[PDB]
Amino acid sequence: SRAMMNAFKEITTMADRINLPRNIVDRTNNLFKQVYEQKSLKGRANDAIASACLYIACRQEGVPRTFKEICAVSRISKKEIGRCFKLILKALETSVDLITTGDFMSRFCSNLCLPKQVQMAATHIARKAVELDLVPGRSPISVAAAAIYMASQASAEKRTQKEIGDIAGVADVTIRQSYRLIYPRAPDLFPTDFKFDTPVDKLPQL
């Protein structure tokens, strides 16, 4: 047992750089030990397997912007976390898709001190994203709550998957399946309003 003890130090060191509490460090640790012996993770990326697990326990509630942020905390082969991620996600998808309807108001989506600047900026992204059909996996209203958590990372306004997506009582497959594939290689969905409070000029991924 060696790499196993090395993946536990990368699971707690990653949450310490994401500004998250030990709560996310308790899920990323139990997430790696639960998928550390999978039939596709003999041990070729202890830091890449933990980073993904972090994007899970945090995407549920405790991560601003999106995975693009949970990645800035880890730098172990960014070409693997993407794969190993789909593996730790299949072992625990979610099964929350049971609303995707109580998000048309978009008024209670800013109960965490969020500025309307990102509220009108998010609608602009889902405006051309839903009108162009880039990821109609679930429904259109899903792009509404996914555009709110997507604008938080491009409107110089960071938030949390909880106060940004959980407050929408929509579904985890709406924000994660809305941007999971709503861009070819960047957020080029803005119509012209979203001036891009943040200087990303290329902020893909949610």
Swiss-Prot record:
GO terms for cellular component: cell division site; chromosome; germinal vesicle; kinetochore; nuclear body; nucleoplasm; nucleus; protein-DNA complex. It is found in: Nucleus; Chromosome. The keyword Nucleotide-binding does not apply. Found in a ternary complex with TATA box-bound TBP. Part of a TFIID-containing RNA polymerase II pre-initiation complex (PIC) that is composed of TBP and at least GTF2A1, GTF2A2, GTF2E1, GTF2E2, GTF2F1, GTF2H2, GTF2H3, GTF2H4, GTF2H5, GTF2B, TCEA1, ERCC2, ERCC3, TAF1, TAF2, TAF3, TAF4, TAF5, TAF6, TAF7, TAF8, TAF9, TAF10, TAF11, TAF12 and TAF13. Associates with TFIID-TFIIA (DA complex) to form TFIID-TFIIA-TFIIB (DAB complex), which is then recognized by RNA polymerase II (Pol II). Found in a RNA polymerase II initiation complex. Changing residue 90 to E: Reduces interaction with SSU72. Inhibits interaction with VP16. Inhibits RNA pol II transcription activation induced by VP16 but does not affect basal transcription. Changing residue 75 to E: Reduces interaction with SSU72. Inhibits interaction with VP16. Inhibits RNA pol II transcription activation induced by VP16 but does not affect basal transcription. It catalyses: L-lysyl-[protein] + acetyl-CoA = N(6)-acetyl-L-lysyl-[protein] + CoA + H(+). Its EC number is 2.3.1.48. Keywords: Acetylation, Acyltransferase, Chromosome, DNA-binding, Host-virus interaction, Metal-binding, Nucleus, Phosphoprotein, Repeat, Transcription, Transcription regulation, Transferase, Zinc, Zinc-finger. The lineage of its organism: Eukaryota, Metazoa, Chordata, Craniata, Vertebrata. Changing residue 75 to L: Reduces interaction with VP16. Expressed in the inner cell mass forming the embryoblast. Not detected in cells from the outer thin layer trophoblast (at protein level). It comes from Homo sapiens. It is an enzyme of class 2 (transferase). This is Transcription initiation factor IIB. Acetylated. Autoacetylated; autoacetylation at Lys-128 stimulates transcription activation. Changing residue 176 to A: Reduces DNA-binding.
